[PDB]
């Protein structure tokens, strides 16, 4: 009972300190920057071959190779330039919710409702793709696998916790706890030393991969957070929730900078991605179309559209040349 | 596709696509059903021809040249709103209710109410199974059907009591284009597969009728 009072006063101290740092909103300082106009983006490629809903997609580090997981139980690696299929990996469980690509192109980790993160080796001497390691230890559905190196991966689950794994040994090196709801997404910072995870408790909190410490927590959303992605400089991140609102939080100021809500938007955000410059905030919505937000003025700088069903995944190449979108209509479209 | 190496890469892609289409053909002869219900309600012992295969449990019994795949979602112990949309394309929903449990009956009704009126399952027909007729028949004599349902007013006979429970479950439908196929089952019933088969065939006709434009 006494500690409960201590908990409350600590929140008041944080709120007062957080409010005292606020001097001017982001939309008030950059009011003199000229708008970026209309970003009209045209479909350049249409990747077909999936026979079920597409739930995840990750870009290769060379901005040419893609990976996509679907309910059909197939894992396809695409040549984004010539639209060819490089690999086709049959999964054990057809219920895959996330699917990641290694930064070196050697491995691919891709898992889902089976509570297991399966890692596949592409550069094998036998010419086929084999399941190198199956990571187990999560009691809930898996989401947002992210490779750190060729032998280190961070995973998120519905156990209200995320885990840091060692692919060689197979043991859970570090476990990050503190969420009070299913964790739906995570993103790795460019300096590969920090990451943020968005959970169902309407809160995203910054975690340290080396120490396993919740350095900071961020609030403001009214519903569960569905996606997250860092600003390109690794000093801010953007979240997407079922509240049909996008928000930009700053790690140094510990306060949200601006909101990306529009009166015509009803359905929540599914995916969040940034451009190479950090000016266009692309977000996928449940009303079958993606919107491009000017991340500095909260102005809709065009709409992608085109898809027939809910857009479930977004992806921007490392060089920023193209944007890949996946939806439940079993089609991947590449925009530019 | 100009270079010699790129010509073989295109040949590899076309060979991959052939197997992708072939696997899709073999994935159209199976019926995907969803198992739901409270614990200890017989949701794992409906058909004695199991041929099963913590998390998701599959069951792939076959009947009359048709493949039935049953997905048991129990044991996840997570928020259903985040992964129940994966089963948006299931043919039907199989719900199991235990008539001898007077305490979990209200718990079962909450489960049925949430699932039936879910936004993803607004058109998926439900095959509702009422289990353990004999156990319920003996239980009602010892304790009347009034502690669980204080609003009951009809005769204390088995026929009226069992039908009264059925009416409550169908009172939660509240939607068109959806039909609830009920059936009373016991422990020593072998024709559960036959009951599922005729309901699934009946559900397919309704969806085909809407697609053809007749209705």
């Amino acid at each position, epitope marked *: 009972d006494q500690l409960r009072q201590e908990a409350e006063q600590l929140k008041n101290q944080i709120r007062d300190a957080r409010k005292a740092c606020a001097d001017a909103t982001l939309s008030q300082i950059t009011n003199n920057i000229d708008p970026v106009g209309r970003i009209q983006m045209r479909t350049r490629r249409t990747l077909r071959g999936h026979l079920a809903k597409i739930y995840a997609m990750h870009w290769g580090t060379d901005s*040419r*190779l893609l990976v996509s997981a679907s309910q059909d139980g197939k894992l396809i690696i695409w*040549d984004s330039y010539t639209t*060819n299929k*490089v*690999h086709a990996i049959p999964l054990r469980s057809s219920w895959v919710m996330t699917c990641a690509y290694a930064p070196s*192109g050697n491995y691919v980790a891709c898992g889902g409702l089976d509570n297991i993160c399966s890692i596949y080796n592409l*550069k094998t*001497r*036998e*010419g*086929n793709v084999r399941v190198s390691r199956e990571l187990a230890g999560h009691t809930g559905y898996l989401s947002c696998c992210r490779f750190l190196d060729d032998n280190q991966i961070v995973t998120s689950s519905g156990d209200t916790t995320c885990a840091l794994w060692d692919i060689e040994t197979g043991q859970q090196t570090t476990t990050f706890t503190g969420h009070t709801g299913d964790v739906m997404s995570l993103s790795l910072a460019p300096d590969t030393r920090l990451f943020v995870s968005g959970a169902c408790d309407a809160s995203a909190k910054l975690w340290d991969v080396r120490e396993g410490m919740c350095r900071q927590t961020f609030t403001g959303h009214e519903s569960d957070i569905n996606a997250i992605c860092f600003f390109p400089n690794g000093n801010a991140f953007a979240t997407g929730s079922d509240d049909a609102t996008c928000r930009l939080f700053d790690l140094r100021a510990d306060q949200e900078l601006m909101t990306y809500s529009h009166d015509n938007i009803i359905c929540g955000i599914t995916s969040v991605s940034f451009s190479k410059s950090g000016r266009l905030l692309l977000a996928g919505y449940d009303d079958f179309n993606c919107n491009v937000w000017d991340a500095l003025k909260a102005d809709r700088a065009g709409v992608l559209a085109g898809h027939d069903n809910r857009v479930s995944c977004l992806g921007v190449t490392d060089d920023g040349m193209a944007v890949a979108t996946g939806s439940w209509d079993s089609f991947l479209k590449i925009w530019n | 596709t*100009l*270079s*010699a*190496e*790129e*010509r*073989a*890469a295109l*040949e*590899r892609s076309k*060979a991959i696509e052939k197997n992708l289409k072939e696997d899709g053909i073999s994935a159209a002869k199976d019926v995907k059903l969803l198992l739901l219900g409270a614990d200890n309600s017989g949701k794992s012992t409906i058909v004695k021809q199991m041929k099963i295969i913590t998390g998701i449990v599959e069951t792939h019994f076959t009947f009359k040249n048709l493949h039935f795949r049953l997905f048991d979602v129990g044991g996840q112990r997570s928020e259903r709103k985040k992964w129940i949309h994966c089963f948006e394309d299931v043919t039907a929903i199989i719900f199991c209710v235990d008539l001898s449990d007077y305490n979990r009956m209200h718990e079962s009704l909450m489960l049925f109410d949430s699932i039936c009126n879910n936004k993803f399952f607004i058109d998926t027909s439900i095959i509702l199974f009422l289990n353990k007729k004999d156990l319920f028949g003996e239980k009602i004599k010892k304790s009347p059907l009034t502690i669980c349902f204080p609003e009951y007013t009809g005769p204390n006979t088995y026929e009226d009591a069992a039908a009264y429970i059925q009416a409550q479950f169908e009172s939660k439908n509240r939607s068109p284009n959806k039909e609830i196929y009920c059936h009373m089952t016991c422990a020593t019933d072998t024709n559960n597969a036959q009951v599922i088969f005729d309901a699934v065939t009946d559900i397919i006709i309704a969806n085909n009728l809407r697609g053809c434009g007749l209705y």
Partner: single-chain antibody, 233 residues
């Protein structure tokens, strides 16, 4: 362990027919394209025929076009080469090579052990400057060969392959496009080039690097090898 073994060699009379079998054990044979390469006595390597994965696309060399035939038995993991009429030119050590083609693949990594066949009594021309180069260990060696056309495709890839045939062994792939090191080769090897002139450099040469070096083009069929540069110590 990847292993290709060939059998069916021997002494045959002119005008007869022989069949060579290449049984594979250690890799997914059904996904690889298999070539036949023959090496005449102390003359050099020469491409013969190629069958694609799934027996879709088949090619033959102009020398033995319409005379040889290649067949593929995927369930048995065996590759055949049936020769109808044999002259005195057919005598050579026939090798069996696997090849897989996709974005970023290595289509000439593994060569078979080779079988010896003895018989009793337009195209891209690649030329190697020299035939014998004496050198001592620790000294960098540069090997260069030219070509008729420009192997640099419009896609940005240059199709040049460098092989090393140690004495008494089978050729081993070192560089497969212009500078892409093969799997398991030492990092001291490096390659470069510009369109029609290419160079292979070996820094900090070791005693086991001696042998005959061949440069081959894969821009267009038929595949043509170089004259062959021999390193002496």
């Amino acid at each position: 362990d990847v292993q290709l073994v060939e059998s069916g060699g021997g002494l045959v009379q002119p005008g007869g027919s022989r069949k060579l079998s290449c049984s594979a054990s250690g890799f997914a044979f059904s996904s690889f394209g298999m070539h036949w390469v023959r090496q005449a006595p102390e003359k050099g390597l020469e491409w013969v025929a190629y069958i694609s994965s799934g027996s879709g696309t088949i090619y033959y060399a102009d020398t033995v076009k319409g005379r040889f035939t290649i067949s593929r038995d995927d369930p048995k993991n065996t590759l055949f080469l049936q020769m109808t009429s044999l002259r005195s030119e057919d005598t050579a050590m026939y090798y069996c090579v696997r090849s897989i083609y996709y974005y970023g693949s290595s289509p000439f990594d593994f060569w078979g052990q080779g079988t010896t066949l003895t018989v009793s009594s337009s195209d891209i021309v690649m030329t190697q400057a020299t035939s014998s180069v004496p050198v001592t260990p620790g000294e960098s060696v540069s090997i260069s060969c030219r070509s008729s056309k420009s192997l640099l495709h419009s896609n940005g890839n240059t199709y040049l392959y460098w092989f090393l045939q140690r004495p008494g062994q089978s050729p081993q792939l070192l560089i497969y496009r212009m500078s892409n090191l093969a799997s398991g080769v030492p990092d001291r090897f490096s390659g470069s080039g510009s369109g029609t002139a290419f160079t292979l450099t070996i820094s900090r040469l070791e005693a086991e690097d001696v042998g005959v070096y061949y440069c081959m083009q894969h821009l267009e069929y038929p595949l043509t090898f170089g004259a062959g540069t021999k390193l002496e110590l």
